[PDB]
Amino acid sequence: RAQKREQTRARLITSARTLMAERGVDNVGIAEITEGANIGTGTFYNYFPDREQLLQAVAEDAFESVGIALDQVLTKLDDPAEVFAGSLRHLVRHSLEDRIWGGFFIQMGAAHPVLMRILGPRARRDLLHGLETGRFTIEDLDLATTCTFGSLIAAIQMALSADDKDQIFAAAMLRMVGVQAAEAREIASRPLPEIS
Amino acid sequence: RAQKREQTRARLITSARTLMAERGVDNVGIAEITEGANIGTGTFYNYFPDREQLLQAVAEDAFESVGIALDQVLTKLDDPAEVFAGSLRHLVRHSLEDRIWGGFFIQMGAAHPVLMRILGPRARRDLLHGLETGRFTIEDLDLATTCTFGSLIAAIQMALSDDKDQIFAAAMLRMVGVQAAEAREIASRPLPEIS
Numbered sequence A: 001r002a003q004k005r006e007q008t009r010a011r012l013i014t015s016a017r018t019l020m021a022e023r024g025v026d027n028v029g030i031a032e033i034t035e036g037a038n039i040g041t042g043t044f045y046n047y048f049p050d051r052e053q054l055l056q057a058v059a060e061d062a063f064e065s066v067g068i069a070l071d072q073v074l075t076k077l078d079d080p081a082e083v084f085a086g087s088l089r090h091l092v093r094h095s096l097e098d099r100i101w102g103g104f105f106i107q108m109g110a111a112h113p114v115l116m117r118i119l120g121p122r123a124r125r126d127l128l129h130g131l132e133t134g135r136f137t138i139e140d141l142d143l144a145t146t147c148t149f150g151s152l153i154a155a156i157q158m159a160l161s162a163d164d165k166d167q168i169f170a171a172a173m174l175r176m177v178g179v180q181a182a183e184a185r186e187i188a189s190r191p192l193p194e195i196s
Numbered sequence B: 001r002a003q004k005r006e007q008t009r010a011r012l013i014t015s016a017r018t019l020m021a022e023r024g025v026d027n028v029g030i031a032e033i034t035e036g037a038n039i040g041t042g043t044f045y046n047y048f049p050d051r052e053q054l055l056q057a058v059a060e061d062a063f064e065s066v067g068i069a070l071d072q073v074l075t076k077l078d079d080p081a082e083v084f085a086g087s088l089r090h091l092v093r094h095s096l097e098d099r100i101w102g103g104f105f106i107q108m109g110a111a112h113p114v115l116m117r118i119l120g121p122r123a124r125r126d127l128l129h130g131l132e133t134g135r136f137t138i139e140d141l142d143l144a145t146t147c148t149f150g151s152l153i154a155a156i157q158m159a160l161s162d163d164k165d166q167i168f169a170a171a172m173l174r175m176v177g178v179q180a181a182e183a184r185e186i187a188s189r190p191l192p193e194i195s
């Protein structure tokens, strides 16, 4: 049935996440994942065409969780520049602390597309907000959104293979959207609201 | 000696580029490539472990050619901002007009590392100069250069799906501390022909 497939995909996603969180997205095979979901190994490809799709579902789950948490806290700040900066700083910190996250930004070339499906609409919103209040200067909204995540990935990959890294990165993104060079740094250094 | 091994590698690179420039990166296999280099299909793996390494070498060849060209023109301008902007615009224009380039950005996950090792040092140089001059405001030179290419890739991928090069360059200027208002002006000045 289609209902059986529905819950199995869900169980596989849960299995993959639990295992990768412990050992790394790169150190878990589908045999172990199918075991965790309680199904025959040779039956995996009955729910996912390949490994990548499953990886993407796990990444969506991770990014969406933070996205929702960010929408709960951050947006409650008045300065659009702080909302955007704070959001970015949380992503960077999560990347340097979550085993599974670091794995997404390195061993996954589809990180960008996933980030765009889940956090893109949120970032665009935050940027549009800053544009409407004259806080930001942006010529193309979609470009700023996609470049932000392209930069995030590169930024996290560098940091991972190496401290206010999050602050420095956020400042650069603030400057990219039209914030005075000196002001940007200050805004990216404001106390960061707890995300947990 | 293994000197022939080196010659073959070079011939394979030449073959892949010629073929991919006419048919597109994704429509050319080991079969066609080895044929252009005049060797058997199977012997391919005696020169490259995978098709991916050859693809990277072809991209290196294309990025280096433009890098060298830029080093002999753009760098002659007096405004560091315009040197950086113009260089980025050439990269965007090539990406949208050259069949082979489009393929590197939407058919190769190693785009960033290849760009970073060939153009990275060049962009970093131009950014440092602009930092010396006080034209830019950058806290971490490596971060700025790796972010520029991260952005370039994303920007090109989007475009590939009227003056997009100017807009991209302006945003990068803004990212490095250039006044939002004067950024678009600099990014719209006549572009010096690279070749």
Ligand SMILES: Oc1cccc(O)c1
Pocket (backbone or CB within 6 Å): A067, A070, A083, A084, A085, A087, A088, A119, A122, A123, A124, A126, A127
């Ligand atoms: O959820 C997000 C992610 C990145 C930037 C932002 O403003 C919001």
Ligand SMILES: Oc1cccc(O)c1
Pocket (backbone or CB within 6 Å): B066, B067, B070, B083, B084, B085, B087, B088, B091, B119, B122, B123, B124, B126, B127
């Ligand atoms: O060769 C390059 C490529 C991109 C930016 C730059 O300043 C130089």
